[PDB]
Design a protein around this ligand. Structure first.
Ligand code: LBN
Ligand code: 6OU
Ligand code: 6OU
Ligand code: 6OU
Ligand code: 6EU
Lengths: 525, 121, 87
């Protein structure tokens, strides 16, 4: 268990003993066997080669792989399925010192893989989770490793056939490049964009992980090419839907009991069409919301943190299904659900303000102040409201005649809309005035200005990063639009081209997807 | 901030005027009566009976919390940032506005420039 | 268009090749001709002298202007009208 399979070879490798590791395999020890346990704590991989690679010993890994007695298996995996390349990503921590180390080790092991086994390529393999090393880095938040992988070029002609970025030419400050995107967009198992966008938001760098070289241009290309007009068509159709729904709700029949007979006039025929369209849009939104949860199946812990704008479009349709249920049940209450679905719909146009760079932070602020600032302030305020309300209604039993009425009358004190009258006589009126004066000072002055100062901090903290927030919300929209229609992706021609630019050591010409990009830097001459 | 606030005003106003069809008797009157809630000059009365009065109170309480408390203090905190950002550079702003005035005054009258002797010599 | 008028002289100037630029005019090449195009991207001026001046080569500009075979025209401009000083 704890020491299952671990030998003096592992200790020597961890101890930086070149002689001990050499003698271990010189005697005849086999490195293929791997040690696993609960401690295996620090996860450096089970294969000894993975441990040596992760422990800053390139000489040791070279010796193990070149060992004539028993060369190490480069593509071995543990029971779970992590490979050596996966282990390298698993140990990155985004720090400047660590990034250079891990990138260097990754590059060296990759070059060794090509030199030893040109026929096989080791980067394509996937673990049990099924995500390739770049995908694993993207999902796990390792911006440094992802940046290294996405844009790396090997100038050695023999080792230049496994690079991602085939530089096309450089002409002064500008350095035209030709990236791969061979598994960034439209890769079956997973895409590097999908894992970045569909993250728990606990992943640290997702906001700043879309500034990487190919991803920025790739997303700004999909937006400019075809998505920016699909989004505006969607916004315009939602505007038409809300106008029709508002018109049909405003002009609803008022005398009678539902359902209503169809009067043979144009004014009442238009209203039935409006009702039909409003309900049909309430089924489209229902099915879209259901489909979202089936595919994503988000954790109930983080249901509102990451899918706040998908819960609201689902609720705005639940309120209308609940009204078409009560409208055919001969219940007049269908209106109490319809107008809630009406106020839901209009304020849901703040979802479409993420298609505008400057206008897209008000939606983010409203969302973040309702979940963080305003939600955990309701247990602090409610003890005050219910304590000074029970106290006030008990004192004057002998407006403040009920618990509901007293709660309402003291809530208006909190928001400065209440009147300290004291006109009506009460028994114990010197302690009633003291109670109300304490309540107003505590809630209106002291406690309501604490919320106003805590929401100000939130606004200040998420108004500096407007560029960061905007681009991720745009990437999510691009992903959703692309995935919505299959023929859209099929005819999108997302990759810049499908070109043959090099030949593998096997002697067969290789053609792959790629996308030319450009950048400008002349400071280095 | 007028596209953010107007969706709220027109959504909670159509909702409020549709609910109580059976002050809040017109779209103009409801828009006005809810605007005063945003700026803290409105009264939550509920004295006049309405059908569905437990959802009318909920609607108005949601509107006041969203607009008066949450959403109006966002504007007040965003204008504070602007004031803070352009109150540090007062020297920079002043001199350019003075240069524009000088240019306009000089160009206004030809004889003014002719007899100005602008160059030292 | 893209390569309208650009010669090995321009590439050598951009490459910091003193021998190539010297030999270009030694053979008899004329620097008065200018290369223009959509790429001309990074706008360093059309005149080769402007390019050399903008590319951190004072020796090259001095050689081009002093060149006995064909001294460069200091006050030349492109079609638009930008001069070397404007560049
Ligand atoms: C007809 C074509 C409708 C398809 C467009 C579409 O999906 O837009 C959609 C409107 O869809 C509707 O709800 C409108 C349906 C009824 C329209 C009748 C009025 C026409 C006169 C636009 O909205 P969306 O971007 O699908 O989703 C926005 C909300 N989530 C789900 C992204 C969070
Ligand atoms: C007024 C607020 C009304 C409804 C908001 C309900 C959503 C609250 C939790 C969402 C954010 C969240 O999970 O925060 C993360 C975790 O916090 C929580 O789990 C808080 C749970 C409180 C539940 C009410 C951080
Ligand atoms: C700061 C507080 C300023 C307000 C003090 C005056 C309160 C009104 C008041 O005195 O009402 C009169 C008497 O009421 C009282 O006795 C209340 C006096 C207690 C005030 C102390 C409360 C301060 C709490 C904050 C800490 C009404 O009855 P009458 O006029 O005697 O006949
Ligand atoms: C914080 C909110 C404090 C105010 C709660 C009391 C509302 C006034 C109230 O209950 O009015 C009475 C009943 O009204 C209601 O049923 C409304 C209760 C729903 C309150 C929840 C709204 C909170 C929204 C913020 C999120 C008037 O009719 P009656 O006295 O039963 O005859
Ligand atoms: C799903 C949740 C959390 C929610 C559903 C409804 C009941 C909601 O009250 C809340 C809690 C609340 C209620 C009253 C005052 C403050 C907060 O917030 C929203 C929700 C809060 C708002 C909406 O304000 C917004 O945040 C719009 C918005 C912002 C960002 C978005 O990405 C977005 O996408 C749709 C929408 C108004 C209501 O939706 C509305 O129109 C009515 C009448 C009730 C509001 O519950």
């Amino acid at each position: 268990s704890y020491y299952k399979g671990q030998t003096a070879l592992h200790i020597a490798i961890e101890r930086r003993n070149m002689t001990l590791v050499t003698l271990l395999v010189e005697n005849g020890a086999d490195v293929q066997a791997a040690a696993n346990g609960d401690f295996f704590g620090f996860y450096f991989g089970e294969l000894p080669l993975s441990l040596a690679a992760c422990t800053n010993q390139l000489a040791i890994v070279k010796f193990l792989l070149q060992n004539s007695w028993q060369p190490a298996d480069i593509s071995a995996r543990d029971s779970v399925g992590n490979t050596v390349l996966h282990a390298l990503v698993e140990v990155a921590d985004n720090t400047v010192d660590n990034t250079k180390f891990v990138t260097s080790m990754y590059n060296e092991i990759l070059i060794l893989g090509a030199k030893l086994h040109p026929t096989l390529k080791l980067e394509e393999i996937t673990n049990r989770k099924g995500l390739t090393p770049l995908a694993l880095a993207a999902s796990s938040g390792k911006i440094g490793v992802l940046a290294y992988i996405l844009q790396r070029e090997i100038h050695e002609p023999e080792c230049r056939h496994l690079s991602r970025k085939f530089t096309e030419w450089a002409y002064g400050p500008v350095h035209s490049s030709l990236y791969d995107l061979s598994c960034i967009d439209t890769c079956e198992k997973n895409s590097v964009l999908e894992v970045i966008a569909y993250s728990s938001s606990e992943t640290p760098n997702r906001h700043d992980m879309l500034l990487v070289e190919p991803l920025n241009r790739l997303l700004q290309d999909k937006w400019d090419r075809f998505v920016k007009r699909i989004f505006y068509f969607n916004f315009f159709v939602y505007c038409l839907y809300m106008i029709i729904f508002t018109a049909a709700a405003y002009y609803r029949p008022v005398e009678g009991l539902p359902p209503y007979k169809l009067k043979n006039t144009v004014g009442d025929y238009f209203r039935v069409t409006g009702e039909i369209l409003s309900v049909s849009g309430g089924v489209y939104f229902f099915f879209r919301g259901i489909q979202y949860f089936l595919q994503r199946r988000p954790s109930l812990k983080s249901l509102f943190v990451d899918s706040y704008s998908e819960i609201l479009f689902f609720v705005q349709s639940l309120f209308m299904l609940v009204s078409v249920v009560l409208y055919f049940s001969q219940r007049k209450e269908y209106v109490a659900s319809m107008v809630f679905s009406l106020a839901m719909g209009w304020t849901n146009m703040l979802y479409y303000t993420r298609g505008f760079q400057q206008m897209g932070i008000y939606a983010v602020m409203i969302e973040k102040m309702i979940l963080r600032d305003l939600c955990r302030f309701m247990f602090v305020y409610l003890v005050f409201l219910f304590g000074f309300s029970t106290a006030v209604v008990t004192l004057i039993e002998d407006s403040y005649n009920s618990l509901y009425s007293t709660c309402l009358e003291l809530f208006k004190f909190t928001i400065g809309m209440g009147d300290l009258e004291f006109t009506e006589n009460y028994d114990f009126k010197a302690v009633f005035i003291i109670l109300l004066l304490a309540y107003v000072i505590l809630t209106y002055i002291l406690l309501l200005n604490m919320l106003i100062a805590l929401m100000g901090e939130t606004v200040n903290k998420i108004a500096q990063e407007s560029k960061n927030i905007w681009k991720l919300q745009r990437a999510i929209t691009i992903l959703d639009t692309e995935k919505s229609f299959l023929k859209c992706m099929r005819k999108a021609f997302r990759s810049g081209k499908l070109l043959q630019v090099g030949f593998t050591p096997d002697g067969k010409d290789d053609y792959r997807w790629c996308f030319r990009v450009d950048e400008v830097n002349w400071t280095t001459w």
